[PDB]
Structure formats: structure tokens, C-alpha cells
Write a protein that binds this ligand. Structure first.
Ligand code: NAD
Ligand code: NAD
Ligand code: CA
Lengths: 344, 344
């Protein structure tokens, strides 16, 4: 039976722990002992790992939810992963570099991985998919899980779906059995890069959606911004992804559904509304409303402008490039509409 | 020669369209500035609605707070309203269009053309019959459609949005584009009329489902999954009762989004789930004469799918039908999504 290690214990990692723990305790093909690597913290005199292993509640990152008793918190990441056939990577992108340094050399020979990390790394073609970063560093085949999946709602067992991107078909099916429940439904698609690139690009669209909200517009306008954005994400994937790219993938939960949710609510939408209404800078708004964190939407747009410059294709992505110019070239946020309005 | 336009209908969307078409017809030489609008007569405060429109230039009941262009003239007799028209815009709730076509049969100018804005379906010998086919066969005019993410109140406020014109004749499509398009109302002409019209009709069924989930307290993950799964069933329905690309137009994805977030079907479905009052009672109390289109479309869909022996393949469509018409408890709606063919 296959052993599972959840690498990460935050909001989403704990929500995922509820699903994986519950399936591993019921399904014969998985070992019921699911390890979860927990970055140790002092929670009013008690180690967070001890809290998880005695109270079965991540009181800091998923308070109010019982974790399945078979999920074991492990404060050392090598000890968490050394024995696992399946590694679920679910940490903030900032920390995956360090985690992978500690793990290289210490994994089982046929270990496989699935990344839940939404975002994008750096490399030769400008961007590099995070799952390729992990896989190359650690030498393991990689899958991805991406969808319209807010962690608090998943923890509450409110119905939702998600996309598993996995090249190997038996692996995709194995991962579906691990993570699917009556209220967390899974589609397995044999693409990885197309599933994964939506998670980065959607935040660029969501900044533009926020500008439109900040300008007084409503649902019809947001719907056009999502529609044109989706078209630019499809075209961009076809330019950027190594392999074949079909439009249909973008209608999976990783594409259109996660795009809809992010454009109706989220950090990128909220800050971009504030930017359009208060004229304050993104850096200022990050400090005043995100406690100094980098908003990924504007940063990805700037990265897209560099790629398109390398390819000679800036003029074919007006919505992406309008987000870029409003965030970083001082274009007035009213001209963002002028671009929706003189589009093709 | 210039073309004369008749708007057949005067509701929430009817009146918003009269604002657009009235303004374009007054500024463009190829359209006679005199646009007639057939207004089903109503006694309002001792006065005729047609006379309120022709004196006050506003449809105070169905589009309050907006002035209609004074060149738009309300007309109570539909034959008189259409008699001299080259272009007829059909925009009435789908339950009335049959009767109106019987009153107009035989009385139209020799080479008249039509465009249907009506979001519904009908039934015929091939199972599905499109409303544009009903109109066109019964009146003997060629038919186009206009469908998109077009909440009428926002269009009337000149908030930016898009729509899709479906038209087989490219010259005719260009003419209708000129008639309808404004700097805040952008039009794409495509030739796949049937698919455009099906999208418009079926999205209101999905929106009833969406409203049910809002009313039971599911959040955005569930709404996004209802939207996405609704889109999959829409695509499967088109493939059977009619290509992917049309669903990326405004009439597909965009309209599904705007409707499941801000339409009248969604709002009444939510109240139904929260209050247990009936659709019919809620329609009368909350929409002040405006008409739901989704529940009836859901009934007709079930009948169409029954005759192709395909009911069981469309569980979301059928879940909406059975809650609205067969007394299935709205608490059970979601269970219809937990075994959907998309995740099999
Ligand atoms: N939270 C959601 O609703 C949600 C939903 C879908 C996807 N995601 C994605 O999952 C990934 C993680 O999201 P999250 O909600 O768990 O974030 P989170 O901020 O709640 O994660 C808490 C994490 O902090 C990590 N951490 C803190 N300090 C650390 C340190 N010095 N070294 C190593 N790790 C440290 C811990 O490993 C812990 O996993 C993100 O990429 C996000 O894109 C989140
Ligand atoms: N309202 C919107 O936001 C919107 C947007 C796009 C498309 N549509 C679609 O437009 C079509 C018409 O919708 P609407 O908003 O203009 O109408 P509506 O929902 O406002 O209904 C009001 C109209 O119903 C008419 N009516 C009532 N009883 C009648 C009767 N016995 N006989 C004839 N007419 C009667 C009235 O003349 C009134 O004008 C529908 O298919 C709708 O799905 C609506
Ligand atoms: Ca009908």
C-alpha cells in the first residue's frame, strides 16, 4: 500500500490533509499513516506538532476543523518524506526552494509528486513551471492539482471540483482515488503545463477585473474581462508551453472556474480596485492591505511583457499588456477600458 | 434607401435595446430615425403605458430611471408597429412569441429580416426547435440572433459589455452590427447561429441551479463548479441537438458568468432556496412584471432529452427541472452533482 506525505501544513495543506487522511483511512491501496510536515511553532506553550497529534486540529491554520486522526504531524521534512511513495507539495512558493534542497537524495526510488502550488518560477523561457522546478531538483515525476478550491470551503465540505494534471495515466488515476470524495470531484487530464500555467496567468486578468470594479463597472463588464482574459491565457499558453495545447483544457476547473473566482474575489482583485480608486501605488497598497506581501498579479504581467518582447508579440496581448502598463508605466487606469473598447 | 426598424417587445431588455437602437438609428443615415416599439398595453396609474412612453420618454415600469430616445415611438398594435419595417428585433419573453407571430403572419414587408434576442427554446419534430426557427418559418423572414452577457440595467447604464450576433449572411450581419453597436456595446458577428441561440437559452437553467446554491449557503467554489458543469452540459447538448469555439464567445462563457452572478433567474432561485415560497409567487413579488426564463426552459429541455432518451446524461439540467416541477427538495440539488459524467 502506498505511503503519502503532505509537504506543507498551512490553510490548503490542512484542508487537503482532511481529504487525503479520510481516503487513506478507508481505501486499502493507501497506507493509513499520512505524514504531514509541519514547520514547528510555539502555540501558547505547546508545539504545533503536539497540538496536531493530540487534539487533531491545526489550530493556527485551519482552526475549527478536526483533522483525521491518521494524519501525523512531523516537524522534520526529511523524516516526513523519507518513506513516501507520494509527495503532495503544498507550501508557499517562497519556501519550495529551501524545502527541495533539504529533500534531494532522501526520497524513495519510485517516489512521485503532485504540486498544489499556484504561481510560477523563473528560467530559460522566462517563466518556469514550479512542478518542473521540484521534479528536476528531486528527480521525480510530477503531477499538479489546480482548481476553483478555496481551502475554508473545502474544509467545510461545500461541493467543489478540481483538475489533476498528470502525464502518466495510472498515476493520475491513483491520485484521483486518493483525493476524490463526494464533495471534492476530480477531472484527470493528461496535460501538466497547460493546467499549471492558468494558476499564474489568472491573477493578471484579476487585476484588470479589479480596475473595472474600481471604475464603477459591474457583472457584464467583469464577464467580458474574464472572457477576453481567457482568450489571452489560451493564446499565451500556446506560445509558451512546450507541448501541444488545446483550448478545451482551459474549460477545466483549473482554467475558467478558478479564473471566475479569482476575478470576483481575492487579493489581486481587491488591491486592483484600491489602486484604481485611491491612486495609491501597488507597493503602498501591499503594505496597507496585505501586510507587505508581493501581489503576484502585477509581477506576472511584468514578466509577461519581457517574454512577449523576446518573442516580438507584445501587440497581440492587449489585455495582459494593459495591466502591465497601468501597473508599471503610469498609463491611467481609465485607459484600461479604452483597450476593451478598441479590441478584436 | 434607408431601413426602418421595429422593436417587437418593450420589457427590461426591450427598453434597453430601444435606447441603443434609437440612438444609433438617429445618428446613422442608413436607418430611418423613426423606430417603432410594440408595447403590450398596460394601465398604469390610470394611464396607458404607451402614452407614458410617448410623453415621458421612459418605460417607468420595466426600465425606470432611463430616458428612451424621443425618436422611439411606442405603439400598441403589433401589426401597425411592424407594418413598414425592414428590420424586426424580436425581444419578448419566450412564452409570448408564438402568439405574436400569429398576429403578424402575413403582414410584413416583402424582404423583411429579423433578429431574435429571445432566450428560450421550443419543441418540434427534430426534438429541439430553436425560437429563431419558429419565428422565421412562421413569418417567412430570414433570422439572426443576438445573445451575450447583457444584464439590461447595466447596458442601459452604458457600462461596457459585449454581445454575439449570430448571422449566416455576412452583409446582413454587418448591417445588424452597425444597428446595435456602441462604444460600450461591442458586437462580434459569427455564423454559428444555432450554437449562439442554444447558449443563450440554456445558461438560464444553469443560473437557477446557481441560485439554489447561493440560497443554501455554498460559496464561490460551488458556484464556479455549477457554472463550469453547466457549461459542459451546454456543450454536450449543442453537439447532440445542433464546434468548441462558439462557447468562448460572449454568448457562452461570459453570459453564464454574468447571469449566475447577477441575473433574475439566479435571484429568484436564491429566494426560493431561502424562503420556501414558490417560484411563481417569488416571480410576481420580486420582479414587478418581468419574466423568468430558466425554469420553463428547464421543463422543455427535460421533454427534449426524454425523447432522445438522454435524460440521465444531463444531471444538472435535470436537477433544476425536478426541483422546480417535481417537488425534489432543494437540499438534494447538490447530490445531483456528486456523480456527474464529467468526473467519471
Ligand atoms: N489557502 C487556499 O485557499 C489555497 C487554495 C488553493 C491553492 N493554494 C495554494 O497552496 C499553496 C500554499 O497555500 P496555503 O493556504 O497553505 O498558505 P499558508 O500561508 O496558509 O501556508 C502556511 C505555511 O506556512 C509554511 N511556512 C511558514 N514559514 C515557513 C518557513 N520558514 N519555512 C517553510 N515553510 C514555512 C509552512 O510550511 C505552512 O505550510 C499556495 O501556493 C497557494 O497557491 C491555496
Ligand atoms: N432583462 C435582461 O436583462 C435580459 C437581457 C438579455 C436577454 N433577455 C431576454 O429578453 C427576452 C425578453 O426579456 P425582457 O427583459 O425584455 O422582458 P421582461 O422580463 O421585462 O418581461 C416584461 C414584458 O413582458 C410583456 N408581457 C407581459 N405579459 C404579456 C403578454 N400576455 N403578452 C405579451 N407581452 C407580455 C410585457 O409587455 C413586458 O414588457 C427574454 O428572453 C430574456 O431572456 C433579458
Ligand atoms: Ca417554449
Amino acid at each position: 500500500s502506498k505511503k503519502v506525505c503532505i509537504v506543507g501544513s498551512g490553510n490548503w495543506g490542512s484542508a487537503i490533509a482532511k481529504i487525503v487522511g479520510g481516503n487513506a483511512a478507508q481505501l486499502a491501496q493507501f497506507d493509513p499513516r499520512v505524514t504531514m510536515w509541519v514547520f514547528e511553532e510555539d502555540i501558547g506553550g505547546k508545539k504545533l506538532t503536539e497540538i496536531i497529534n493530540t487534539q487533531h486540529e491545526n489550530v493556527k491554520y485551519l482552526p475549527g476543523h478536526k483533522l483525521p486522526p491518521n494524519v501525523v504531524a512531523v516537524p522534520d521534512v526529511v523524516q516526513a518524506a523519507e518513506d513516501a511513495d507520494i509527495l503532495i507539495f503544498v507550501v508557499p512558493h517562497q519556501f519550495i526552494g529551501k524545502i527541495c534542497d533539504q529533500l534531494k537524495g532522501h526520497l524513495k526510488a519510485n517516489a512521485t509528486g503532485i504540486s498544489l502550488i499556484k504561481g510560477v518560477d523563473e528560467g530559460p523561457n522566462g517563466l518556469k513551471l514550479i512542478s518542473e522546478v521540484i521534479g528536476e531538483r528531486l528527480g521525480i515525476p510530477m503531477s499538479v492539482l489546480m482548481g476553483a478550491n478555496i481551502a475554508s470551503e473545502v474544509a467545510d465540505e461545500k461541493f467543489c471540483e478540481t483538475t489533476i494534471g498528470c502525464k502518466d495515466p495510472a498515476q493520475g488515476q491513483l491520485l484521483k482515488e486518493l483525493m476524490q470524495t463526494p464533495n471534492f470531484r476530480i477531472t484527470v487530464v493528461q496535460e501538466v503545463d497547460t493546467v499549471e500555467i492558468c494558476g499564474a496567468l489568472k491573477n493578471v486578468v484579476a487585476v484588470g477585473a479589479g480596475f473595472c470594479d474600481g471604475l464603477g463597472f459591474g457583472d457584464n463588464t467583469k464577464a467580458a474581462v474574464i472572457r477576453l482574459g481567457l482568450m489571452e491565457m489560451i493564446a499565451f499558453a500556446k506560445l509558451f508551453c512546450s507541448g501541444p495545447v488545446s483550448s478545451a483544457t482551459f474549460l477545466e476547473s483549473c482554467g475558467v472556474a478558478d479564473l471566475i473566482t479569482t476575478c470576483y474575489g481575492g487579493r489581486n482583485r481587491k488591491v486592483a480596485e484600491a489602486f484604481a480608486r485611491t491612486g495609491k501605488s501597488i507597493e503602498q497598497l501591499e503594505k496597507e492591505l496585505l501586510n507587505g506581501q508581493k501581489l503576484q498579479g502585477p509581477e506576472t504581467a511584468r514578466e509577461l511583457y519581457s517574454i512577449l518582447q523576446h518573442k516580438g508579440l507584445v501587440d497581440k496581448f492587449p489585455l495582459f499588456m494593459a495591466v502591465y502598463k497601468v501597473c508599471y508605466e503610469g498609463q491611467p487606469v481609465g485607459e484600461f477600458i479604452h483597450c476593451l473598447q478598441n479590441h478584436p
